[PDB]
Amino acid sequence: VIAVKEITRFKTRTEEFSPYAWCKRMLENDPVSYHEGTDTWNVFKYEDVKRVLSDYKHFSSVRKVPEKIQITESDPPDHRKRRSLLAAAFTPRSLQNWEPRIQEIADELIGQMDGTEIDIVASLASPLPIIVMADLMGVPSKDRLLFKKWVDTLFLPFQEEVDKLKQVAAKEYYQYLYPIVVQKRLNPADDIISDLLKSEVDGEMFTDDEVVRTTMLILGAGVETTSHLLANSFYSLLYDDKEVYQELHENLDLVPQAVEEMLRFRFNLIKLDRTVKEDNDLLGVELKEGDSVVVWMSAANMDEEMFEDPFTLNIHRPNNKKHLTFGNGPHFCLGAPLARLEAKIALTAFLKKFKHIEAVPSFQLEENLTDSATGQTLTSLPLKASRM
Ligand code: HEM
């Protein structure tokens, strides 16, 4: 694995969190770039990133976990089958049915917020995805705090005393959930575990172990990323364009468009890796089998060939939803509708309750950021809210 910081070599976390000047420089001066220190080819332009992510015949997701559940690191023809197995639990019917459940959870969390000082990461951005996933999975509401404790340890964290805590949590999680999975095979309900147990593609079906382990992968894909989107949205409403909050407060139908502009502009720096599978000179440079390619979706999202005035936050830009933050092609995020729905529901609920927010002047961004797979992520974000 190549960390972003090995390529950017930025001095501060802040420059990764707000990397606009670097993206511009790469897009304009070196859009298909060889980085000798990591032996990577780096792709920045929108059209090139989109093509690389479509062209699984030349750019593989297999680098260098039971196989049936390894969806991200697989290529066609197995990838399609493995994705379809999981997709049975994320149908549009299910997503529509989830909306009132997610609403109720967001209402409970916002319910507990008071003109007092709120840590939006601790009070909303972290817990909402976790509590939602517990509910959607079919974990009994009585065990929510216990489940959340394991998820916090495993997926927001954060010592080779840490390794030990995670080993213990993973075992506790597995021995909690496995008997639930067993019970649900015999008595299905309307929940993710039950839908996974019934899923069948070309005669392939999940074992109970595979169901449990798929739930752990779902958490690993969805918790920290969704929390990053929620926290960054509030960051942007506090520090990027202060008028946007008022616009959304007076017109809640703008919230989905605002979420797409946060995915475009405030999800930094997200990249994906591929490995060349078939020799090719289609990016205009010849790459041979085994070469490493890094596609920078954060930069593609700032490409003026696709997005007008790309270094400005603009929720009215007509084509923000063409961003590449969820990928493109065969591996495009299976969670994207859920992620979009959680963010719309959370923001809307907060906007209903609070007329104004304001930044806390003592907050230092550099001291409240940590690494993640999808870019620098906020460990807290304080704000003052006016119930007004
Ligand atoms: C803002 C939130 C999210 C972001 C930005 C995000 C981003 C991504 C990206 C970029 C990929 C493509 C990886 C690749 O091509 O190598 C991906 C794949 C995936 N995402 Fe997400 N994701 C998010 C939330 C979620 C959630 C909530 C779930 C599940 C509940 C989830 C499940 C998946 C799965 C299963 C894949 C693999 C799909 C495949 O390989 O066919 N994601 N996501």
XYZ file of C-alpha atoms and ligand atoms in Angstrom:
431
model
C 0.000 0.000 0.000
C 1.204 3.521 -0.970
C 0.056 6.247 1.297
C -0.928 9.580 -0.236
C 1.792 11.342 1.771
C 4.515 9.287 0.009
C 3.538 10.957 -3.248
C 2.465 14.403 -2.241
C 5.194 14.773 0.384
C 3.228 17.653 1.880
C 4.553 19.272 5.086
C 1.185 19.469 6.882
C -2.040 17.500 7.181
C -3.835 20.683 6.317
C -2.371 20.742 2.814
C -3.809 17.258 2.154
C -7.156 18.331 3.597
C -7.143 21.403 1.313
C -4.902 20.421 -1.577
C -6.300 22.770 -4.212
C -3.013 24.421 -5.299
C -1.270 21.062 -5.744
C -4.182 19.556 -7.740
C -4.110 22.603 -10.051
C -0.354 22.272 -10.619
C -0.599 18.556 -11.408
C -3.630 18.999 -13.705
C -2.025 21.840 -15.620
C 1.618 20.764 -15.695
C 1.957 17.024 -15.181
C -1.313 15.203 -15.648
C 0.153 11.744 -16.303
C 3.152 11.677 -14.005
C 5.814 9.186 -13.017
C 6.885 9.251 -9.372
C 10.184 7.466 -9.092
C 10.219 7.217 -5.238
C 7.111 4.981 -5.216
C 7.470 3.657 -8.803
C 3.966 4.863 -9.651
C 2.231 6.434 -12.553
C -0.170 9.124 -11.318
C -3.253 10.134 -13.260
C -5.069 13.384 -12.611
C -7.379 14.463 -15.440
C -11.062 13.629 -15.283
C -11.271 11.814 -18.623
C -8.105 9.749 -17.933
C -9.159 8.735 -14.384
C -12.614 7.708 -15.677
C -11.035 5.603 -18.420
C -8.566 3.905 -16.194
C -11.346 2.931 -13.741
C -13.513 1.551 -16.667
C -10.691 -0.428 -18.289
C -10.349 -3.415 -15.979
C -8.795 -5.440 -18.876
C -5.678 -3.343 -18.771
C -5.875 -1.924 -15.190
C -6.501 -4.655 -12.620
C -7.824 -4.509 -9.091
C -5.926 -7.633 -8.033
C -2.644 -6.466 -6.403
C 0.928 -7.992 -6.564
C -10.700 -12.890 3.556
C -12.570 -15.786 1.875
C -12.484 -15.199 -1.838
C -16.229 -15.097 -2.352
C -16.374 -11.914 -0.221
C -13.386 -10.201 -1.798
C -15.277 -7.831 -4.011
C -12.938 -4.828 -4.258
C -9.845 -6.825 -5.097
C -11.297 -8.905 -7.897
C -11.677 -8.597 -11.667
C -14.281 -9.876 -14.143
C -15.726 -12.378 -14.443
C -15.684 -13.229 -10.746
C -16.159 -9.585 -9.644
C -19.663 -9.359 -11.149
C -20.845 -12.447 -9.275
C -19.369 -11.367 -5.989
C -20.822 -7.863 -6.251
C -24.295 -9.260 -7.183
C -24.233 -11.492 -4.085
C -23.873 -8.441 -1.847
C -26.132 -6.188 -3.936
C -29.117 -8.342 -2.926
C -29.015 -6.615 0.470
C -28.882 -3.048 -1.014
C -31.833 -3.000 -3.494
C -33.740 0.232 -4.142
C -36.726 -1.374 -2.375
C -34.661 -1.796 0.748
C -33.172 1.687 0.533
C -36.649 3.232 0.283
C -37.806 1.212 3.283
C -34.779 2.280 5.279
C -35.478 6.020 4.940
C -37.872 6.333 7.944
C -35.544 4.225 10.126
C -32.523 6.363 9.371
C -34.665 9.489 9.931
C -35.640 8.241 13.393
C -32.001 7.622 14.341
C -30.851 11.029 13.052
C -33.783 12.656 14.993
C -32.644 10.875 18.236
C -29.056 12.091 17.811
C -30.017 15.703 16.901
C -32.658 15.567 19.697
C -29.807 15.423 22.126
C -28.133 18.517 20.796
C -29.094 21.812 22.521
C -27.165 27.386 21.848
C -24.507 25.081 23.437
C -21.152 23.739 22.015
C -21.386 20.632 19.882
C -18.642 18.268 18.695
C -20.265 17.317 15.432
C -17.868 14.302 15.033
C -18.689 12.818 18.436
C -22.420 13.694 18.357
C -23.424 12.921 14.787
C -20.752 12.156 12.169
C -19.311 9.026 13.957
C -22.362 7.555 15.586
C -24.957 7.936 12.898
C -23.438 5.467 10.378
C -22.695 2.948 13.139
C -26.128 3.010 14.667
C -27.702 2.936 11.253
C -25.668 -0.086 10.178
C -26.600 -1.952 13.403
C -30.249 -1.357 12.808
C -30.094 -2.228 9.083
C -28.182 -5.400 9.818
C -30.736 -6.631 12.334
C -28.763 -6.215 15.534
C -31.317 -6.039 18.422
C -31.723 -2.407 19.581
C -30.918 -3.583 23.161
C -27.358 -4.500 22.033
C -26.581 -1.228 20.239
C -24.129 0.162 22.728
C -22.200 -3.101 22.864
C -22.084 -3.314 19.026
C -20.994 0.274 18.783
C -18.163 -0.321 21.213
C -16.789 -3.078 18.982
C -17.209 -0.977 15.800
C -15.451 2.023 17.457
C -12.497 -0.189 18.369
C -12.341 -1.898 15.007
C -13.238 0.862 12.471
C -12.549 4.280 14.035
C -9.282 3.504 15.759
C -7.490 5.840 15.771
C 0.180 0.958 20.693
C 0.493 -2.664 19.721
C -1.863 -2.624 22.699
C -4.226 -1.349 19.934
C -3.649 -4.533 17.947
C -4.687 -6.526 21.002
C -7.842 -4.523 21.617
C -8.833 -5.039 17.955
C -8.137 -8.765 18.129
C -10.355 -9.070 21.179
C -13.082 -6.907 19.590
C -13.034 -8.865 16.322
C -13.457 -12.127 18.207
C -16.220 -10.756 20.406
C -17.979 -9.357 17.371
C -17.766 -12.625 15.504
C -19.073 -14.739 18.459
C -21.933 -12.309 18.986
C -23.019 -12.166 15.381
C -22.492 -15.743 14.293
C -25.387 -17.120 16.370
C -27.626 -14.317 15.064
C -26.733 -15.306 11.542
C -27.553 -18.949 12.356
C -30.940 -17.923 13.768
C -31.736 -15.721 10.818
C -31.039 -18.506 8.309
C -33.900 -20.407 9.950
C -36.050 -17.358 10.600
C -35.424 -14.527 8.141
C -36.522 -10.943 8.729
C -36.230 -7.760 6.626
C -32.616 -6.914 7.274
C -29.185 -7.102 5.668
C -28.138 -10.353 7.367
C -31.267 -12.119 6.272
C -30.988 -10.831 2.728
C -27.359 -11.956 2.507
C -28.385 -15.444 3.682
C -30.925 -15.755 0.863
C -28.694 -14.300 -1.838
C -27.907 -16.747 -4.705
C -25.911 -16.114 -7.889
C -25.266 -19.020 -10.347
C -25.711 -21.443 -7.487
C -23.265 -19.652 -5.141
C -24.512 -18.681 -1.641
C -22.845 -17.475 1.493
C -21.869 -19.672 4.444
C -22.672 -18.296 7.890
C -18.984 -17.423 8.364
C -19.022 -15.552 5.050
C -22.086 -13.586 6.165
C -20.420 -12.534 9.372
C -17.217 -11.562 7.605
C -19.168 -9.644 4.907
C -20.802 -7.553 7.651
C -17.276 -6.686 8.919
C -16.262 -5.628 5.363
C -19.481 -3.571 4.957
C -18.564 -1.744 8.204
C -15.045 -1.253 7.054
C -16.215 0.198 3.739
C -18.993 2.383 5.017
C -18.449 3.666 8.519
C -15.371 5.805 8.343
C -16.110 7.086 4.832
C -19.643 8.142 5.652
C -18.423 9.807 8.868
C -15.786 11.696 6.775
C -18.489 12.974 4.416
C -20.715 14.118 7.338
C -17.895 15.859 9.239
C -16.433 17.527 6.170
C -19.866 18.893 5.142
C -20.055 20.707 8.496
C -16.449 21.852 8.129
C -17.304 23.374 4.773
C -20.499 25.067 6.180
C -18.327 26.636 8.896
C -15.239 27.656 6.969
C -15.667 27.512 3.152
C -18.663 29.586 2.214
C -20.523 30.905 5.189
C -23.706 31.793 3.198
C -24.478 28.256 2.202
C -25.907 27.269 5.609
C -28.596 29.998 5.361
C -29.468 28.972 1.769
C -29.994 25.372 2.809
C -31.873 26.344 5.986
C -34.417 28.298 3.851
C -34.543 25.773 1.096
C -34.170 22.182 2.233
C -34.645 20.871 -1.269
C -31.075 22.099 -1.999
C -29.550 19.636 0.520
C -28.933 16.768 -2.001
C -27.115 19.137 -4.366
C -25.059 20.430 -1.514
C -24.044 16.827 -0.601
C -22.772 16.311 -4.201
C -20.655 19.460 -3.977
C -19.151 18.213 -0.693
C -18.288 14.928 -2.380
C -16.658 16.832 -5.255
C -14.718 19.502 -3.359
C -14.300 18.400 0.249
C -13.313 14.770 0.167
C -9.513 15.105 -0.021
C -7.308 13.360 -1.020
C -8.991 10.222 -2.350
C -7.105 8.030 -4.741
C -7.316 4.477 -5.917
C -4.658 2.004 -6.967
C -4.573 -0.315 -9.996
C -1.991 -2.689 -11.414
C -1.369 -3.011 -15.068
C -2.521 -6.423 -16.386
C -1.935 -6.062 -20.126
C 0.796 -3.985 -21.707
C -0.651 -0.824 -23.127
C 0.293 2.772 -24.157
C -3.207 4.216 -23.922
C -2.599 6.984 -21.374
C 0.082 8.120 -23.952
C 2.791 6.324 -22.074
C 3.675 2.659 -22.328
C 2.924 0.685 -19.241
C 3.861 -2.941 -18.807
C 2.277 -5.698 -16.815
C 2.866 -5.186 -13.081
C 3.249 -1.384 -13.239
C 1.409 0.494 -10.459
C -1.084 3.211 -11.349
C -2.607 5.690 -8.898
C -5.739 7.594 -10.015
C -6.440 10.814 -8.099
C -10.226 11.282 -8.015
C -9.891 14.445 -5.872
C -7.924 16.061 -8.700
C -10.171 14.744 -11.441
C -12.964 16.457 -9.480
C -11.151 19.807 -9.957
C -10.556 19.458 -13.687
C -11.837 22.569 -15.523
C -12.445 20.468 -18.615
C -15.340 18.929 -16.791
C -16.254 21.394 -13.962
C -16.605 25.137 -14.358
C -14.663 27.298 -11.901
C -13.472 24.084 -10.272
C -11.633 25.621 -7.313
C -14.782 27.379 -6.026
C -17.406 25.813 -3.821
C -20.647 26.131 -5.804
C -23.690 24.096 -4.871
C -25.472 25.397 -7.987
C -22.917 24.136 -10.439
C -25.152 21.975 -12.649
C -22.976 18.872 -12.976
C -21.462 18.314 -9.468
C -22.958 14.837 -9.426
C -20.460 13.791 -12.184
C -17.641 13.711 -9.515
C -15.575 10.518 -9.222
C -15.498 10.259 -5.405
C -17.401 6.984 -5.538
C -15.236 5.668 -8.425
C -16.468 4.739 -11.844
C -17.020 1.592 -13.858
C -17.374 -1.866 -12.342
C -16.261 -1.156 -8.776
C -18.312 2.061 -8.397
C -19.344 2.280 -4.749
C -22.181 -0.142 -3.823
C -22.852 2.059 -0.807
C -23.306 5.304 -2.684
C -27.151 5.489 -2.390
C -26.923 4.755 1.322
C -24.179 7.229 1.867
C -26.098 9.927 -0.052
C -29.257 9.123 1.934
C -27.543 9.281 5.371
C -25.955 12.629 4.521
C -29.197 14.139 3.199
C -31.137 12.897 6.248
C -28.539 14.050 8.809
C -28.024 17.496 7.312
C -31.759 18.069 6.830
C -32.484 17.105 10.457
C -29.769 19.441 11.774
C -31.034 22.323 9.499
C -34.568 21.822 10.773
C -33.423 22.315 14.354
C -30.702 25.021 14.013
C -30.966 28.356 12.234
C -27.294 29.324 12.605
C -23.933 27.798 13.296
C -20.619 29.398 14.109
C -16.979 28.249 14.261
C -15.000 28.021 17.497
C -11.985 30.269 17.234
C -9.703 28.122 19.338
C -10.098 25.096 16.992
C -6.864 24.200 15.185
C -7.446 22.043 12.119
C -3.859 20.678 11.990
C -4.222 19.173 15.502
C -7.570 17.458 14.739
C -6.766 15.458 11.585
C -5.773 11.776 11.142
C -4.906 9.486 8.189
C -7.456 7.358 6.492
C -7.871 5.362 3.297
C -9.963 8.140 1.791
C -8.013 11.204 2.900
C -7.390 13.254 6.040
C -10.193 12.865 8.424
C -11.436 15.128 11.361
C -11.097 13.614 14.862
C -13.339 16.414 16.301
C -15.099 19.468 14.932
C -16.576 21.859 17.486
C -19.257 24.333 16.646
C -21.755 26.668 18.246
C -25.338 26.184 17.168
C -28.271 28.547 17.515
C -31.422 26.705 18.143
C -32.894 29.986 16.892
C -19.019 8.735 1.391
C -18.983 7.455 1.542
C -18.285 6.525 0.652
C -17.266 6.728 -0.240
C -16.634 7.963 -0.662
C -16.994 5.487 -0.827
C -16.089 5.335 -1.859
C -15.858 4.126 -2.548
C -14.997 3.973 -3.693
C -14.189 5.046 -4.292
C -15.108 2.719 -4.117
C -14.381 2.159 -5.317
C -13.128 1.355 -4.958
C -12.363 0.858 -6.173
O -12.696 1.088 -7.388
O -11.275 0.224 -5.973
C -16.013 2.049 -3.171
C -16.353 0.708 -3.293
C -17.189 0.057 -2.377
N -17.968 0.704 -1.461
Fe -17.934 2.590 -0.913
N -17.815 4.524 -0.274
C -18.573 5.058 0.622
C -19.522 4.427 1.414
C -19.829 3.107 1.381
C -20.831 2.499 2.191
C -21.763 3.246 3.117
C -20.893 1.145 1.860
C -21.755 0.056 2.387
C -22.698 0.271 3.274
C -19.841 0.941 0.871
C -19.559 -0.219 0.234
C -18.664 -0.258 -0.872
C -18.379 -1.586 -1.472
C -19.035 -2.889 -1.104
C -17.470 -1.339 -2.435
C -16.914 -2.369 -3.423
C -17.697 -2.382 -4.738
C -16.989 -3.187 -5.855
O -15.783 -3.490 -5.784
O -17.758 -3.629 -6.758
N -19.262 2.163 0.591
N -16.561 2.988 -2.318
